Design an enzyme around this catalytic site. Structure first.
Site, PDB file in Angstrom:
ATOM      1  N   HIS A   1     -14.234  53.938  -9.161  1.00 40.79           N
ATOM      2  CA  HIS A   1     -14.822  54.521  -7.941  1.00 40.79           C
ATOM      3  C   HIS A   1     -16.208  55.120  -8.170  1.00 40.79           C
ATOM      4  CE1 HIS A   1     -12.602  58.292  -9.106  1.00 40.79           C
ATOM      5  NE2 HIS A   1     -13.778  58.830  -8.789  1.00 40.79           N
TER       6      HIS A   1
ATOM      7  N   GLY B   1     -16.368  66.153  -9.840  1.00 43.14           N
ATOM      8  CA  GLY B   1     -17.172  65.876 -11.024  1.00 43.14           C
ATOM      9  C   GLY B   1     -16.319  65.689 -12.264  1.00 43.14           C
TER      10      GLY B   1
ATOM     11  N   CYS C   1     -13.783  63.551 -12.590  1.00 42.17           N
ATOM     12  CA  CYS C   1     -13.274  62.180 -12.769  1.00 42.17           C
ATOM     13  C   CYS C   1     -13.805  61.514 -14.013  1.00 42.17           C
ATOM     14  CB  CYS C   1     -13.503  61.339 -11.523  1.00 42.17           C
ATOM     15  SG  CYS C   1     -12.683  62.037 -10.086  1.00 42.17           S
TER      16      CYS C   1
HETATM   17  C1  LIG Z   1     -13.720  63.723  -7.186  1.00 49.04           C
HETATM   18  N1  LIG Z   1     -12.295  63.888  -6.896  1.00 49.04           N
HETATM   19  C2  LIG Z   1     -11.648  62.980  -6.131  1.00 49.04           C
HETATM   20  O1  LIG Z   1     -10.450  63.092  -5.888  1.00 49.04           O
HETATM   21  C3  LIG Z   1     -12.436  61.826  -5.542  1.00 49.04           C
HETATM   22  C4  LIG Z   1     -11.507  60.729  -5.085  1.00 49.04           C
HETATM   23  C5  LIG Z   1     -11.033  60.694  -3.782  1.00 49.04           C
HETATM   24  C6  LIG Z   1     -10.130  59.722  -3.383  1.00 49.04           C
HETATM   25  C7  LIG Z   1      -9.698  58.760  -4.278  1.00 49.04           C
HETATM   26  C8  LIG Z   1     -10.199  58.783  -5.560  1.00 49.04           C
HETATM   27 CL1  LIG Z   1      -9.728  57.540  -6.677  1.00 49.04          CL
HETATM   28  C9  LIG Z   1     -11.081  59.755  -5.980  1.00 49.04           C
HETATM   29  C10 LIG Z   1     -11.634  65.005  -7.483  1.00 49.04           C
HETATM   30  C11 LIG Z   1     -10.862  64.895  -8.630  1.00 49.04           C
HETATM   31  N2  LIG Z   1     -10.241  65.923  -9.214  1.00 49.04           N
HETATM   32  C12 LIG Z   1     -10.368  67.123  -8.650  1.00 49.04           C
HETATM   33  C13 LIG Z   1     -11.120  67.372  -7.475  1.00 49.04           C
HETATM   34  C14 LIG Z   1     -11.261  68.660  -6.900  1.00 49.04           C
HETATM   35  C15 LIG Z   1     -12.025  68.837  -5.784  1.00 49.04           C
HETATM   36  C16 LIG Z   1     -12.664  67.758  -5.183  1.00 49.04           C
HETATM   37  C17 LIG Z   1     -12.541  66.502  -5.701  1.00 49.04           C
HETATM   38  C18 LIG Z   1     -11.775  66.270  -6.869  1.00 49.04           C
END
Ligand SMILES: CN(C(=O)Cc1cccc(Cl)c1)c1cncc2ccccc12
Ligand SMILES: CN(C(=O)Cc1cccc(Cl)c1)c1cncc2ccccc12
EC number: 3.4.19.12
Lengths: 304, 304
Positions: A41, A143, A145
């Site tokens: 992603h 951030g 990921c």
């Molecule tokens: C960047 N992220 C995502 O879930 C993005 C995403 C959204 C939807 C699907 C996928 Cl595969 C990724 C995040 C990860 N971890 C914790 C997070 C805490 C707050 C905000 C986003 C967080």
């Protein structure tokens, strides 16, 4: 003495972290040998995340669109491919800090350390368990990921998790290092059911053995139980049913303490039926299930 | 989202660990620049530990008696000196992996990460607090002496603790990196009073703010209190009295959540008087005091 939620030393993994940027999206990558691994992603904008067609999105990208930076130095990308939910960016330079490593798919109930990273920079390390429902209760912000989970055996890092997503319930989902999600999750911004979780019975028993080794013994009782009887209780309290395979892996802890596994099950049965009565075990007022039997022996007897 | 007992990434410290052997005693040392720091009791045999005359014991030792090994390579010792309860072995080679560092004496109630080591090899990392009574509730076995505690700020490691001793009660005592013990402890095998400990009030309040940020809010109530009233309760429950300096450091968390510090004190007052009623906060069934206000903001908003 003492018993802590201990992580593996993260140095070997810190040396592998890089920042990967594609367009306006930046996340973390893992640089091992001449390949950088990251969540696919990274190629999406926020508008794409509702239902991304990753194949079509990736076709718009060329090697020069993936910016990979290891600290302050830039890596030259000479190839890219998507494998399941991960991208693999071939770079022209083997990471000189690549430790001995393996990619493993861990089983639910197993533990691992997570090196949380932001912009390719490590921020913290913590230990957690893969829940029976294939989620992890991590600590991750936007951030994070591309941060990875791992175990270390002497000089070998076994990478088992790459962070991809936070579900609306605040728990986390990710993949093995071949990009296969743990659980039913998909990499898209939709509400997704995690499914009923359970408590990891064999780890709670392991931690009760750790408690006895460390001198917390108030919960030992004069009772025993059978696997069948204990499993009626485990069902009522949403614990995983105990099998003989779990009894077998608890053998070393049973020998160390002289407490038969079924006698420790009778202590766990009484704690489940009566609670802790305002008391604590290893500084916890709940039954802890994030320590495997291997973790307990490693922490109580020693391993470097 | 999520909130974990997170340690700093330990890589920078792992690069500093060495094994120090004197006679038949082996423990861990910290190699920074051209000096290796280790507990002075490396010069003792078990017979000496009842009441060692460290000055006399050290006079029997020469540079060639201290064997220092960094992984598999041997360091040449060209000087030795005792400073308080630490030995400083001057070596002919500056550690090429020396990070930017400082030696600091932490205050009680502050937190730090510990890199547990055995035979100069890192085994695990965990986060803990310096108790108000200057003990740490670590996880250490025989061979862990010389393991260090630290904090990291960007690229600077601030070393604050070196492990020396486990008290008969199973808690730990050690020194700053100038060899000064935290607390009343002495490096000898005698029963030693640690003294009354207290709960770190400002950290419990910080962690209640972390809970609100992460969505655990059931404990917020319609009440407020005063510092004087709250402190009558803190005394009864063996908590540290809250001062305006503590209220001031809680300002950022109070602004983030919109919950006035004295309103959060009223929630803590009610939890102390009523308990948790079988409920949990951030996966704990007890009030957690090992997260400072700085830790909470670092973990909830981000810092690498
Ligand atoms: C960047 N992220 C995502 O879930 C993005 C995403 C959204 C939807 C699907 C996928 Cl595969 C990724 C995040 C990860 N971890 C914790 C997070 C805490 C707050 C905000 C986003 C967080
Ligand atoms: C080596 N050690 C000592 O306390 C030795 C010592 C004894 C008396 C005084 C001093 Cl200054 C050091 C230990 C440290 N940590 C944890 C320990 C767990 C079990 C066994 C020993 C442990």
């Amino acid at each position: 003495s003492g018993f802590r939620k201990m992580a593996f030393p993260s140095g070997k993994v810190e040396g592998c972290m890089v920042q990967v940027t594609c367009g306006t999206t930046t996340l973390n990558g893992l640089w091992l040998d001449d390949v950088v691994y990251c969540p696919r992603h990274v190629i999406c904008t926020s508008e794409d995340m509702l239902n991304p067609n990753y194949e079509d999105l990736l076709i718009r990208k060329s090697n020069h669109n993936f910016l990979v930076q290891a600290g302050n130095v830039q890596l030259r990308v000479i190839g890219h491919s998507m494998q399941n939910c991960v991208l693999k960016l071939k770079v022209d330079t083997a990471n000189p800090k690549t430790p001995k490593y393996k990619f493993v798919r861990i089983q639910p109930g197993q533990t691992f350390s997570v090196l949380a990273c932001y912009n390719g920079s490590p921020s913290g390390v913590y230990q957690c368990a893969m829940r029976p429902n294939f989620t992890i209760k991590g600590s991750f912000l936007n951030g994070s990921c591309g941060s990875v989970g791992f175990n270390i055996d002497y000089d070998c890092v076994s990478f088992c998790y790459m962070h991809h997503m936070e579900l609306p319930t605040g728990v986390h989902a990710g993949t093995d290092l071949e990009g296969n999600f743990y659980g039913p999750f998909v990499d898209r911004q939709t509400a997704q059911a995690a499914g009923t979780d359970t408590t990891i019975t064999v780890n709670v028993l392991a931690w009760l053995y750790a408690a006895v080794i460390n001198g917390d013994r108030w919960f030992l009782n004069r009772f025993t139980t059978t696997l069948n009887d204990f499993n009626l209780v485990a069902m009522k309290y949403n614990y995983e049913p105990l099998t003989q395979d779990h009894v077998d892996i608890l053998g070393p802890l049973s020998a160390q303490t002289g407490i038969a596994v079924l006698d420790m099950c009778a202590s766990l049965k009484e704690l489940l039926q009566n609670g802790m009565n305002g008391r604590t075990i290893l500084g916890s007022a709940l039954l802890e299930d994030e320590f495997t039997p291997f973790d307990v022996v490693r922490q109580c007897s020693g391993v470097t």
